[PDB]
Amino acid sequence: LKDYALEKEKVKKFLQEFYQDDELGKKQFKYGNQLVRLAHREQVALYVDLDDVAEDDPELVDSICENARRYAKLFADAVQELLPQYKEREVVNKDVLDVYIEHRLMMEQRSMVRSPQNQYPAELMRRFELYFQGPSSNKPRVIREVRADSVGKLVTVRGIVTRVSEVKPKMVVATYTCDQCGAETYQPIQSPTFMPLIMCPSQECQTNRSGGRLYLQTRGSRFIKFQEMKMQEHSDQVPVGNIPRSITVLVEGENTRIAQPGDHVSVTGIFLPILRVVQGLLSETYLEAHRIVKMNLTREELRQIAEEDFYEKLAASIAPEIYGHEDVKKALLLLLVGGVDQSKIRGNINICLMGDPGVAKSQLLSYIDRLAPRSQYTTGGLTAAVLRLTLEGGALVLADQGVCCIDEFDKMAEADRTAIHEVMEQQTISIAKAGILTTLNARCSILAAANPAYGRYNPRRSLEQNIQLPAALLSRFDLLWLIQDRPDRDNDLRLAQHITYVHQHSRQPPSQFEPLDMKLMRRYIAMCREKQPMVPESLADYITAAYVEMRREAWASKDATYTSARTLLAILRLSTALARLRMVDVVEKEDVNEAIRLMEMSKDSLL
Amino acid sequence: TVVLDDVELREAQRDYLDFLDDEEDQGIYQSKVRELISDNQYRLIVNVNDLRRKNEKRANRLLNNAFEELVAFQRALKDFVASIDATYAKQYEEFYVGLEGSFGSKHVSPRTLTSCFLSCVVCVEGIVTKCSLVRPKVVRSVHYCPATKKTIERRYSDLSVYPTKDEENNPLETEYGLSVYKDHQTITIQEMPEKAPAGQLPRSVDVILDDDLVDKAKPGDRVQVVGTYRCLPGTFRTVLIACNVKQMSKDAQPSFSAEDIAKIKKFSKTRSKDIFDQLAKSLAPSIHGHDYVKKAILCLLLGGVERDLENGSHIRGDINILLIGDPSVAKSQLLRYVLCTAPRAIPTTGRGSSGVGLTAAVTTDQETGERRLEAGAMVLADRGVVCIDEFDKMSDMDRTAIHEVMEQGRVTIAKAGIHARLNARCSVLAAANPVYGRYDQYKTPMENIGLQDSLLSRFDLLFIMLDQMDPEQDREISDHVLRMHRYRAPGEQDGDAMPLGSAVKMVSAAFMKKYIHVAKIIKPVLTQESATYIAEEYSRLRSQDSMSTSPVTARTLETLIRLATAHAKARMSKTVDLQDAEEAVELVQYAYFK
């Protein structure tokens, strides 16, 4: 419909004649400067913002959007023409390829009409690469929404990297030398595989009919850094009644090694088909990557925050269908806000919930998983793995900067117990399938839930007697709540009355405070994460006083209540976490004392 | 050899536009496309019978002749949308027509879908079993030739094949953005398992979905599809091209006859107090004793009421019963009673269905090496019943997946990069003899079988039946056994047995089946009086829990809620009666306290 030569002119006009008032308003031909860098091998990639083209030709940006593979080659050939102009120094022949390119160019210039076959491919006149950066107008597209209609277009997405292969050299322009003639042969490659050439099409051997057999040479050929990765739907975009959906992404050039599993990245690139037949061909798709970037209210809200029972109301909003466990519901809220990590300190507040079956453990975890921004649910894979050769982060990795709810914690694999032990220690996961201790960042609060062996809990049987989990591993947890279903006819009647209401109403009974919508709760959390409250040194005196007091009670306590410095460290996390709930950047005695109260109650739960 | 004008297609295209031109008339279809424009979809839905009303002839032509008539209709649709809005029409390459309404004889089932309907519209009804992955299918590939500076096209439509070189052998580089691609998925339908004679073989019909119709279906969905049945190029494989798919509710309705409804109403109104026990005695008349079990089994068929909450909590109405007992007790016999009686039940063994097993599975086709997400037995029993025998011999992966479906009624799967989440809400009636026979009444039932201490929690009820060697009890059983054995039909001379068939107070099983089918639709609700009463009993069980079967827990409370709900359904009483809670409480007491 349109003349690509005319488009080639427009880009050449744009690149040569686009500038931006840089820092201190410096009128600078931004791309013009980059071309000069490219001319002297000082750059390799040339990322291009389409909004710059939108600044003077939004229609061109639209045509780039409706088809991107075409315009990439147009720009690349457009830059190919411009670069010889901007050359101003004969820089050193960096790597054999440039001097090889120089050698070929002299040979070609030594030649006058010529058949199209006897000419070098554009892809070999390279060692520069070009990528686009999507316009801010184009809103990011969910991986689900990338349908077949959007193939061939340029799309921006968000997601979580589930896996990424090692860097490897992808061939681009296979080069061959004839057996018995000096003519060199080329073969650009698009498919992931190909048949290598055999017989040279060289004019001399073709005329001579000598059967000059091509022999591949890597030095003549040109490779490119390459990677293969999968990206998963970000948990926020996934509907409740579905699960995350993957998408393959291909990365090459300087975009390689800018991503790890469990990185919440945003990718701009072309969505295109690949074929490794009914009513037409069926072809698997992928997303050729261009740009990768690793991503990170009303006054009544403020009035609500000012309320003293605000945080208590929010705790009541935690699973209002669940009657009871109020102080536990408070504790879960503390985990959701997390710590501060002042400096570093473990901001995540890991909690374990051991208790008899049928006491809302599993339901609570499901609510927490639905509530947290970055959430994972598992039972025990959980940890990373090396599939076949490619990394694949487990649920623990995917919970980074979030929470991993592990139901059925009692039935974990003992190796995995060691794995989470590493996470609670340094918040990283190490693994070696081939004896290669690959360490992965795992910064994620752990919400464990276990059930005692042999039915309900026996109070006479000590801790680590009703349960068969490592006591040292248990003591690592910030809080550890023992939930017992004691037959208490009054309270039993209360819970039953709560249940019958829900059946007779499909609704919780009316409380003092109605629950808030989960999204609003998350908004409060995101506001709470905005703060990093500090600990005044005066509070330390009282804090330490409380610590030695309770530690004395542990010495007084015949059973070792696991009081330690670990106990003190968590108390710091709880206090500053409460300060975040208070939206105050300085911790307070109320926050400290309340944290001690919950700590005491968790110990009281061991009664 | 280039067509100029088609008078018939011209008129047919015009008539459709006239039909879609619903302005002077009631405006329903004009409003539809206006909603279609607002909703951004590109597939109008059409009631075929309205088309019959406006034009019976054209409607007959449409049903008899599908491919041509729809193409004209799509043309009229695209122009009509262009009339209302040109730019919105220009967004989409094409538009689609959705059929609906009554299809007189074209409404068939996969059993009855003979080859006679080829190239005729068909409204099939059935259950989706196999699903294939979404794939994008090229339709119009666009190529550029820098040598000639020339752009070409190549449609495929119904039709080495991929063009890559100019006729001058110049290279052709494709134009991905310009070209047209569409998502495309294949599934397979089968007759509804309840209404499917065992003598006849399976009659499974393929289906092709494209565009928005791709993902509007999963395995184990009761769906009605309307499409054009077409052959394929070569004894020729035959497939149905979907024009519109709709998921009929799995509840459906108890059609039957009003006589059956009236007989049920008269029978229900006769004696509501004894109807539960009268059914229970007549539920499994061949079996002697186990009266609580028969009462329990009736509640399972009746089923509770699922409660879906504002937060998405989905408290299941299904009830789950496990039978443990010594061999040579009427356990397998009892389930075959359920199979004969249950409105919608599927049998299965410990191993489950071949390959797929109990729950769903991914299956390479091996005719094209193609993945297929294939429904398993558990999913197919959704809003129904599954009868598992040798449940102890269930495999370990099934012992894993059973936790999900028991907890959620929902099997998820991500294997082979196949993300899916299938509805599997199904009351389960498992049976498993004790290991090595001869149950020891000292340890847990887990210790005798090995249910990992969790599935017992998942099961609402668990009934033990041991071969107690009481001579009185044996006399009662043996009296029953010989009485049935000695029986001869009323018309017989104590001579010949039944012929070798080449084909496969007391109430009839079919009458029972129809009755419970009607009762399942009833939606009884709580009463404050019963709600208070049950709370006393549950607390009383907690009080009785002091002595030390599994302890009474909150699982037990909701179990009683479903049982009282079930007994309420038995009498068609839309308000749960204290009798319902009363009978459930004593039944649970028998289950935990012999």
Add this chain to the structure above:
Amino acid sequence: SGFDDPGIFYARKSQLQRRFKEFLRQYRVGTDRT
């Protein structure tokens, strides 16, 4: 994308062609005077 095929690029007959080439263009006739 596996949907494209870029074109391959790049006592002896070619030597004999050179011999003809030099002969036709470089052959000399006449003498020093002529």
